[PDB]
Amino acid sequence: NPNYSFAGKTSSISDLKEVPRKNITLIRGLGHGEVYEGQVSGSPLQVAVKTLPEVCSEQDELDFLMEALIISKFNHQNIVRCIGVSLQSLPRFILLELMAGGDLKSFLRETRPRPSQPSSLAMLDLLHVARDIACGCQYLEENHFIHRDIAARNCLLTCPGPGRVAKIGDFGCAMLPVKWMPPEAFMEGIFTSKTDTWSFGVLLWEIFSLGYMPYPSKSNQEVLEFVTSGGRMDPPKNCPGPVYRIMTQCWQHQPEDRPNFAIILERIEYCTQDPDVINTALPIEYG
Ligand SMILES: COc1cc(Nc2nccc(N3CCC[C@H](C(=O)NCc4cccc(OC(F)(F)F)c4)C3)n2)cc(OC)c1OC
């Protein structure tokens, strides 16, 4: 049994809300450990269930246990909740807030304006997603937790239609997310909250490009050398200046020159107030 500390409080496996296996039902798959839609009884509470393969290393179990603790201590509306766990039956379950809208990247890619739906997304939708994730990032900075993989693929959406809310919902050399990392993270291997400020800038790019891979025509090592020598991505198609300027400020070479999330939020709001920003048309992808 390992312990875990966060916001000054310590907790162990035994502090997790163990839900009885008999109160949990799986309805269908979602993704590939492996995750299911399901529901919990007292009308049923609708949940996502992440499972632990019964064939797994002793390290995998420990990581699963630890992950359960880590998620359970977060208390913020823009971070996917832990409903509880079912550890005492096999296979073991972690129970999470069901996010009906899926991951942000996939969502963006399928909702890119086209001739059939020319005004499916507006700038304000993108600024609200940006805002939601920054607010979560601000929670993590306040509480001294460094995510290390703030990317579109690791953010989830409550629903697809309007009123959607986005939330940090996943943890995420060849596996390292090089395109989301600042210079000082390959160089010295050091991490601070200004790490996440950088990755957020990249997230911004992803949001305003409507789901493109960052640094389009570039491999990991190419991006490393490019970024290390002070090179940066261009503005995504139709991207307003004020929004791009937030990205370039997130990508300052000097950690100390990057804004904290309070300042990021302030600047995402200003953007949200500017009519030249919010009246800009998103590009239509030609189908
Ligand atoms: C991405 O796949 C889908 C996910 C969902 N919805 C969903 N809702 C809740 C959870 C969930 N998961 C699948 C992706 C991985 C995710 C997970 O394990 N998250 C870990 C986690 C959870 C909460 C917080 C957290 O910490 C932090 F915020 F720091 F990342 C880390 C669990 N997926 C829905 C879909 O269709 C609508 C999907 O496409 C088929």
Side-chain angles (χ1 to χ4, degrees), residues 122-132 204 207-208 243 246 267-274 277-278:
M123 283 285 165
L124 214 69
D125 294 303
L126 301 181
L127 293 167
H128 290 165
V129 166
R131 198 241 288 109
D132 291 336
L204 264 188
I207 292 168
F208 284 80
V243 178
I246 292 166
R267 293 171 184 182
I268 296 172
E269 280 309 295
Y270 207 80
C271 285
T272 284
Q273 289 177 310
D274 184 352
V277 174
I278 66 188

Side-chain angles (χ1 to χ4, degrees), residues 30-31 35 48 50 67 71 74 79-80 96-103 140 145 147 156 168-171:
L30 297 183
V35 176
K50 183 182 197 171
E67 206 184 353
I71 300 154
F74 293 144
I79 304 202
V80 164
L96 307 165
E97 183 179 359
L98 183 70
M99 303 288 287
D103 63 289
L140 296 183
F145 184 100
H147 192 278
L156 305 181
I168 308 166
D170 197 14
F171 283 122

